Amino acid sequence: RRQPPEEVDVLVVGAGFSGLYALYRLRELGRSVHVIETAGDVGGVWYWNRYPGARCDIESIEYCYSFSEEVLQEWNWTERYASQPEILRYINFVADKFDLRSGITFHTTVTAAAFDEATNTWTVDTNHGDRIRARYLIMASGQLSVPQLPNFPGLKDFAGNLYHTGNWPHEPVDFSGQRVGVIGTGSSGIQVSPQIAKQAAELFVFQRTPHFAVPARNAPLDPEFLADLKKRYAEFREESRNTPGGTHRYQGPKSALEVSDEELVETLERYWQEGGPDILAAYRDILRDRDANERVAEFIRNKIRNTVRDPEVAERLVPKGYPFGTKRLILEIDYYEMFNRDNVHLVDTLSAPIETITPRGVRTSEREYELDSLVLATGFDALTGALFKIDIRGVGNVALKEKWAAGPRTYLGLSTAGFPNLFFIAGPGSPMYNMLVSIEQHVEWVTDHIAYMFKNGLTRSEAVLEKEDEWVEHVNEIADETLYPMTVFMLYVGGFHRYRQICDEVAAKGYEGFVLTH
Template identity: 55%
Template sequence: MADREFDAIIIGAGFSGLYMLHKLRGLGFSAQVIEAADDVGGTWYWNRYPGARCDIESFEYSYSFDEDLQQEWEWSERYAAQPEILRYLQHVAERFDLRRDIEFETRVLAAHWDEGSARWTVTTDTGKSYTAPYCITGLGCLSSFNRPDIPGLDSFAGEVYSTGQWPHQGVDFTGKKVAVIGTGSSAIQSTPVIAAEADRLTIFQRTPNYVVPAQNHPTDREFVGQLKQSYGEFREAQRRSLLGAARVLPQTPKTVLSIPEDEFQAEMEQRWAMGGLVGFMASHLDSGTDRDANERIAEFVRGKIREKVADPDTAELLTPRSYPIATKRLCVDIGYYETFNRDNVELVDLNATPIDTIEPQGVRTSDKLYEADALVLATGFDAMTGSLNRIDIRGRGGEKLREKWAEGPHTHLGLMSAGFPNLFMITGPQSPSVGSNMVVSIEQHVDWIADLLVHLRERGAGQVEPLPESQKEWGEHVDVLFNMSLHPQANTWYLGANVPGKPRVFTVYIGGVHAYRNVCDEVAESGYPGFAIDGEAKSNTVDFEGHVLRLMPAELQAA
């Protein structure tokens, strides 16, 4: 017997869960949010490592659903740091009185579908259980820390920290020898801060990243004042953009290799001066599909690394050459490369001297022992599916989601999975999610889910799930786009390559936020083809590729 019953159970109180709760309340649905932390924030509650901040501009990485909220909130920096983003989400929770429907310090253990009652039963580590017709996950794509399997890790005598589970009281590295394992986004943001405190900092790198400058600065009040006068137009431009961001240098309407050298250099310098990842992720028509074109852009960034890092050998170690630029999500830095000019910082190339073991005194590679008082694990996340697979989710006939996804996730639109009725995944695998401005994608998913629930209520229907054939067709579409791009030439966490034993499956829709939104809109407007509602199936009639092609420049269509 469940402790409480609702119309919907929402798992997670980050950007996704908070807006989902607010949206459902406004539509007359009862909802309960279950959150493992003791407050709201999601990703921005847990990730408190030094230097943590967003890589999308603050006023783009924020809610658009309430005009008063947009007008009243003031961001202090172009790229907000973690504490400010957390304060923003706390403000949202207070402003809309959301905490009264959130069960904090409660971790979901299982969610099981009961075919007889057509309800989900969600059980938790507190012993409480909840039931509802609808279960909605807002778990975040980067919320399950990937603890590395390094021999001897538990034997380390000093302090061990992970960037994804940083102590809330902070850490003082003053006078200490610190070892950082990893050079992904969290390491790129944290190492400049740690280096300024530590007596000695050793950074262990397996694969260097392309890093572009944030060009962070205090908020330009004049710009924000103008923005707030036309926020509606700005938000619509976000929704109809490729990556969910509006204030960027637009994609150049030329192919990279057709641009004269002086013109190309001038344009790239302009992009570099503006900063931010979005202007580089899709800068030219062919930057993501032609390796020679991509290499020209990559070499520009490599030149910047050589300019910033004084020692040529260290600069070369920090220079990516094994994969195309932007096939991993670009990292944005504030002083990362300059950190390697400090006398107290050393870079260790794990390709030349891999880690053999962690010893009580430090990190031993095939070459030597690097002594350390503190160890920082900046080893990323079990992305996209990790958080979902850690919950015992069982659908029709007791089928386990983690078993169904043993060879990779299968979804329709990145929103639902066949065999799991009324289970919705906000920014789930095979949606734009981490390949976009997450807040834009979150709002789009929440609105779409809410519209579908209203549709079901109005027709007196109780269940919805995708058809297996539609799910298969969507997966093939995601793969077609993947194979058209340069992404297959990189081992990334988009593919699960950072987690040993995880199947290599591309989990991000890269057709564009605008194309994806158009697909979802057509599905809704056409009465949800590709889904079964109370067993009544309506085969997919939406041309997925057509939506992408209509937005693709003629030059690429011809290619």
């Protein structure tokens, strides 16, 4: 294990996509930088979420780095949507190309960080006892980096094998001949269940809230397509940077209501057959009005009812109530087709809640389920989970967990008043669709600001309380034009293109909203 240095210009937490780029760029900018990563290697979510079927929901050609021309040319994506193993190879390939691991401390977790106004420096501590002093602290700790253990009664009494998709074994697990239970039907559960059902004797999928999922229609990547794209990859990426989703996507111009029944069915079957989340933008007001939303929602519901041979099973797979697209749209591969298998059973925990885990399995208010293995696909902590596991003290030793107790309050989602020289990558308050585009934009803005601080001899950068309140209010206001609040708003819904413009303007105006001092 590598030892974190005593002093550094910038200390980064996290060796996922965000922290690795920050490390690369701050090196290129002539700054001393170092990373602290709990995991044994690089990758972030793609190092932890090694469960079978883990797959990206953004097309390979978009979900990738663009800062390096060599990488864009030498790497060859193979499928429309990259599997977790491939994304990890891609990440390790970048870490190898640029010798990043020499500036990373693995097998180490940041536990405390306190800002000292006297020296304008952060003092960062780790569980292993290391103490690092850094002028700036970059939190690349992620949004879903804390696997959340569902507070199930009697969980410790389970006699079989317990797995969590967010911390999957680094050696493949063979479920052949087992009775397996999967708890959770989000992205993780929908992706891992079809893979497990190929091995297990009996698979029990425990679902509480049913969610929307459309077919991914994953396909090999035409190698000649990739060849032509590489001769124009920089232009293609700038295109992507000028979109609301940070990805190429057709923008439906027509209102979901003004169309006929046959036209709405044919347009949506088009998307349903083409696959992917682009169906979200089939019509311009899917996420703008409940009526347009429900019209597109019923079509998907009926596609479910038509795929599941058993109408009893189908109707509980059909989401109802909350609107379509308000939660990140899941892509499924043979998931709804799974429930037509004879070794798969859908357990509706809305009708029969889980009372306790037992030595032999899971006991709902209906029966006890005997399971050889239990797979928890129960998501992660909120976007603040990685930060709340750290004792973060700012001016006046006020802990961040307190100020953010009523929610995370930031300026631009990048900084928070009372906590200078601290920046969040891909955190709350910023756009979160194609995270690789948003991550590159965030790393560049932050490391540009840090280079700016060193260039001008300034040593303390702090967001202004009033602008923080203004930002929190603006983010809230733009949200009310959408159906998102129907589930301190954390997500910026304005779109990547408009957000980047905002951030560039702030930077082009001497970092308006910040207070730089020495």
